[PDB]
Design a protein around this ligand. Structure first.
Ligand SMILES: CC(C)(COP(=O)(O)OP(=O)(O)OC[C@H]1O[C@@H](n2cnc3c(N)ncnc32)[C@H](O)[C@@H]1OP(=O)(O)O)[C@@H](O)C(=O)NCCC(=O)NCCNC(=O)Cc1cc(O)cc(O)c1
Ligand SMILES: CC(C)(COP(=O)(O)OP(=O)(O)OC[C@H]1O[C@@H](n2cnc3c(N)ncnc32)[C@H](O)[C@@H]1OP(=O)(O)O)[C@@H](O)C(=O)NCCC(=O)NCCNC(=O)Cc1cc(O)cc(O)c1
Ligand SMILES: CC(C)(COP(=O)(O)OP(=O)(O)OC[C@H]1O[C@@H](n2cnc3c(N)ncnc32)[C@H](O)[C@@H]1OP(=O)(O)O)[C@@H](O)C(=O)NCCC(=O)NCCNC(=O)Cc1cc(O)cc(O)c1
Lengths: 417, 417, 415, 139
């Protein structure tokens, strides 16, 4: 405020704004012209950081009336844009940036990355932005009643269905082997909030439905990595997908959903959590296998394999760098994440991501029989105490914070494209 | 005062005070009479929390003259009762309670749970209460001299002995397979304390003695877990057993006992700690197998197993949820705990908790050679360093906070019984 | 308070019997028992003073966390600004002259100091940050190295090639036996390797040995030089600490550089992937380092150990890391019972990545370096470490080490 | 008892003893594969010890089993650190004393390798080997 790191930032954003508005369109730019606009961004982002290292809590307090209003990622970054022009892109710029190919973008998301990273490092705004992400979403809340009634939802990506106290999720995307994308992520969280707020559900289950692509026709398929074509084409939102899906549904599978002080016992269980059982058919690549690292029980086919392909030229493989080590040790996890190793279902070390491996013939009966072993009450009071020791609140947030800005930098890194 | 909570709570309970006073005992419990007592309790416990979230350190400072007087669990909760009526049960209430049919109690221990938690969550109180249950008990301080001169102490649950510089502890409840209860917890802490202080004990040893019950006669079993008898009836105490065990002797095996500023070298080694060896015969089940995660060296006999059985309807198995992970991975642990899996000594995954698995006719020999390998003053230094890397003072403190209120909840969850 | 002078008269008495008494080796028994009691009351006081005044003491030595000072510098500065708190240059000198068997254990004070310093959420991260900044001797030989591509140093032989900063432990006398001079060539090899824009991946291996028991064959490392240990040649600060806060830490987080070069806002530290290859064996510090590389290779005839168990000292930061590599169970069989994992036994895969016959190790190694090139690896690496070992974790551990180790140094049986 | 290593005839003999001990630093091979001669009666016995698959990786491709790798237990009985091999060895000799061992041993061999089996093999060896002796590449 007084140390005027803001005017420096403000001052800097202009030199950027001017250079863009007066220099030729990206690829039209000369070696020198490239070195100059690039020099301006760096001085700007460099400033975006210094300002937040000392004023994040303030900035956060103004956007949320002093940690008094829970705001989801999208909301928070938007609110940030209009209340602090220059700090983070506006809806417009994100709109424009999208219009082009990854590599003529000025990489504005990096700012959202610097923003999200500052907030999460803060022991005040950190846990607060995280609680806002655990709250149930408006869409899910909207559908909570008709779900309680019909016992079936059917979104473009997933297909929820209650059945014996089981919130059966099914990522049916036969068109794409279930490649994650912007929408897929929305339905996922909606599908998970539904399974968590529906008293009728006791144990949740994620599984990939049968495919429809000629190469896979007839076979179920868990997951086949993040929708590439958008990474090329600019559909992967640092916030509406990469961060959302971590701070959102994937984190609800661990801690559940944060409700309001309604029902009784909220004083000791403000969050409703339930056990999950993922089942892998065919394979689990990329983001997919990222999910297995947070389930209560992993069932795998005999012919299934797991991998985090984003090795040589890619983006971070999600909070996998935060969880893989815990299941396979530092030499496992790097072989898989750095070197690109691929674990097969029937090999020894597969027992360190998967709980059971059975021939497709009988995987179906096996999934069932396990859906009936986590019914218990201790299986909630054991689950919750295990996850606390497994991954600390601080621990997770620390990771996320640095991920936001490290990954933002990967979307735009030249290699990635 | 000012806050206001102290009065809301003071009245909230006052209500239960009356409501209970007027309505009959349980079961008579007309009916949604309960829903009223229910709500009464919930609104009360809910208030017990809010008060402590903001005044724990104060409450703690008043009970211990500002972290100036070390008070053990029993003492602290008692002191709390008389100095803050309504916050936690009195010696009397508990009495009334500890003499009923568990399945029909108001659940006052839950109050004790909300207290132990807020007290441990505080980075102020936290360390202090725990350093108070590091400190050697009186019973042992008292029994020490006779031990030093005799080298023998027959207690009820345990049989202590000094032989060759080895503190040989022998859980000797042959009538019940070394079951569990406060006298056992009292003999174990006393025994461990005596070991750690006896300038004549270099290494500790824990094995179960031969059983006298007809099912396992002639042989010896390690432990058959918590006495179920005394949990049904009522009366596995949340404070004099569950919490005591984990903060008292089980934690001493890991950090040693805390001594006054007497001996030369205190400034650097305020606690006396020594390595410990546990040998398994027949089995460890329940609390028994929980101990295994705290020993330096561990032998079992080929033909035994280790499990924590209560998966579907028991409770939480102590710190096995904070420790098993570090021992066998997230899948292993959820298998052992969540789905009650059992491991046998001669199966591969058994080397995850056991150091040596030796034919019963060779066990005596193995044990004896191990007691001779943990001598040094280096082993003591390397031990202290390693435990620091595994279980940081913080992680443990944090896990015990929640455990106190979660186990308390599980200690009465209607299903448990 | 009046804790200071209190501490002072304490170092006073000690200073006194520091002359009156005869050489260590001819005292008796209230002779010894008296100096010994003295020290205790002094060190005991050194602690209480710092438990409440470390940050102050640190602030005065570094103009309020405004000047980064390396271990040596900091302890020296501490000595002249707070006589009695920690040994002076000369005081140590007397010590190093004697054999580790007869010293008064003056290092223990540096152990008490350096401990309290790292224990603070303010001073510790700073002494640390300070030990991550490029080492002068390194910034000295940087330009020469970049143009040359070759730096020759007593214990280490650096060399850039095909974008690889190959380091080569070459004690062609003594099986690379570590010593506080190697810890110097080593930390310089790392820095140069990190700051040379032409380097993308680092490689640590052992040169061919000259000694008869191993002439013509490579050897990774035989741990610490047991000799200089008895002789009084292993510095608690200049070696044991400088080692874990110096180069070994750099292999994890990189070199903290100055705000100069575009990107500093997101990467104030330059890190790079490193690959370790094991020939013959990794005993001690040799093994300890394998718990910090991105890829470990070893010939099938190798094995690893820290088999200082019944008498030796604490094996560095192994007690902190071995846990996450092979569980608390193995972790203790190794460090407590002195066990060694053979390159080929199944459990060797908890520590090594690849194991091949020595007459193909070279190619296994080459084909290895080319796999950690991309900038995708730099990111994933960096996050993985953020998870495996965190800042607080390392700080807390290194704190207690500072002292614990000190004492383990001047302990009868190790001597 | 194996110290250091069992290469060639050294290894061949280990397929005929009642108990094999080896220090953990050992390994075994017959790594005459691309040029050397036939490794004695190994081709006849290694089969029954480690299957036709391993049998050939050893003798045909020239592979060597390291004392400590799992597959070393197909050839050795006990593997200990050289600074306890002596006792492992002593405590070993006292376990094969009785006349009960003489009988059981003798029957076990009658099953493992029979008279016709050894004869047939040794026959073809007589010649095969001869030729492998005076063969350009071995020379
Ligand atoms: C899975 C495959 C091996 C299948 O091989 P095939 O049997 O050869 O099938 P294909 O013919 O290639 O594909 C079938 C079909 O699915 C489509 N498909 C398959 N994978 C994808 C992806 N990833 N996106 C979009 N569409 C896809 C594919 O385009 C085909 O339709 P057409 O293109 O019209 O032919 C292949 O599709 C493939 O290699 N996909 C690459 C998988 C991949 O690398 N995903 C990258 C994962 N990287 C991350 O998840 C990063 C990440 C994700 C996160 O969620 C969070 C985070 O922090 C970081
Ligand atoms: C061990 C067994 C399988 C033995 O089977 P058998 O060979 O069939 O012997 P049995 O005939 O059943 O028992 C022999 C004998 O010991 C008695 N026995 C065996 N187990 C027990 C227990 N747990 N309590 C009391 N008495 C017991 C049993 O009653 C018999 O005497 P009788 O009743 O008069 O016949 C059986 O006794 C058994 O299933 N016990 C259940 C073991 C168990 O589940 N313990 C629960 C452990 N749960 C905890 O420790 C929870 C805990 C403990 C803690 O310390 C801390 C903490 O935080 C949490
Ligand atoms: C490696 C060996 C088993 C080799 O056996 P051999 O084939 O029998 O060779 P040798 O004839 O004994 O030695 C070959 C040769 O190397 C020399 N050599 C071997 N090891 C050493 C060591 N450690 N120092 C110095 N010189 C050595 C040895 O003296 C010989 O030369 P000569 O004495 O003139 O004959 C043997 O040398 C040996 O036992 N060394 C002991 C290894 C050892 O215990 N190191 C202790 C490690 N302890 C630490 O690293 C502690 C530590 C280190 C750190 O870096 C940090 C920290 O915090 C803590």
């Amino acid at each position: 405020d007084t140390d005027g790191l803001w005017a420096a930032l403000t001052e800097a954003a202009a030199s950027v704004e001017k250079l863009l508005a007066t220099l030729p369109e990206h690829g039209a730019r000369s070696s020198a012209e490239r070195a100059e606009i690039a020099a301006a961004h760096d001085a700007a982002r460099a400033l975006r950081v210094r300002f937040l290292d000392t004023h994040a809590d303030a900035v956060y307090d103004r956007l949320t009336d002093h940690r008094r209003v829970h705001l989801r990622l999208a909301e928070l970054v938007e609110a940030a844009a209009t209340a602090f022009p220059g700090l983070v892109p506006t809806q417009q710029q994100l709109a424009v940036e999208r219009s082009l190919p990854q590599a003529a973008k000025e990489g504005h998301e990096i700012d959202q990355g610097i923003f999200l990273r500052a907030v999460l490092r803060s022991p005040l705004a950190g846990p607060h932005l995280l609680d806002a992400m655990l709250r149930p979403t408006p869409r899910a809340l909207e559908l909570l009643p008709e779900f309680v009634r019909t016992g079936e939802v059917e979104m473009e990506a997933v297909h929820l269905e209650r059945r014996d106290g089981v919130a059966r999720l099914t990522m049916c995307r036969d068109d794409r082997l279930n490649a994650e994308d912007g929408q897929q992520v929305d339905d996922m969280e909606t599908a998970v909030d539904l399974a968590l707020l529906d008293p009728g559900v006791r144990v949740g289950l994620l599984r990939g439905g049968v495919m429809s692509h000629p190469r896979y026709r007839g076979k179920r398929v868990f997951s086949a990595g993040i929708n590439l074509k958008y990474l090329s084409q600019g559909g992967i939102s640092l916030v509406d997908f990469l961060m959302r899906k971590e701070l959102g549904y994937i984190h609800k599978l661990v801690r559940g959903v944060l409700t309001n002080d309604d029902r009784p016992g909220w004083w000791h269980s403000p969050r409703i959590e339930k056990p999950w059982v993922a089942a892998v058919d065919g394979f689990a690549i990329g983001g997919g296998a990222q999910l297995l690292l947070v389930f209560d029980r992993v069932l795998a086919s005999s012919d299934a394999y797991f991998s985090l392909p984003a090795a040589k030229e890619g983006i971070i493989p999600g909070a996998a760098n935060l969880r893989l080590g815990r299941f396979a040790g530092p030499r496992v996890s790097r072989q898989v994440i750095l070197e690109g190793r691929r674990i097969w279902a029937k090999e020894p070390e597969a027992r360190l991501l998967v709980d059971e491996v059975v021939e497709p013939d009988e995987l179906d009966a096996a999934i069932e029989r396990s859906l009936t072993r986590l019914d218990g009450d201790a299986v909630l009071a054991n689950r919750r105490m295990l996850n606390l020791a497994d991954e600390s609140p601080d621990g997770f947030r620390a990771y996320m914070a640095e991920f936001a800005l490290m990954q933002a930098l990967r979307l735009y890194g030249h290699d990635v494209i």
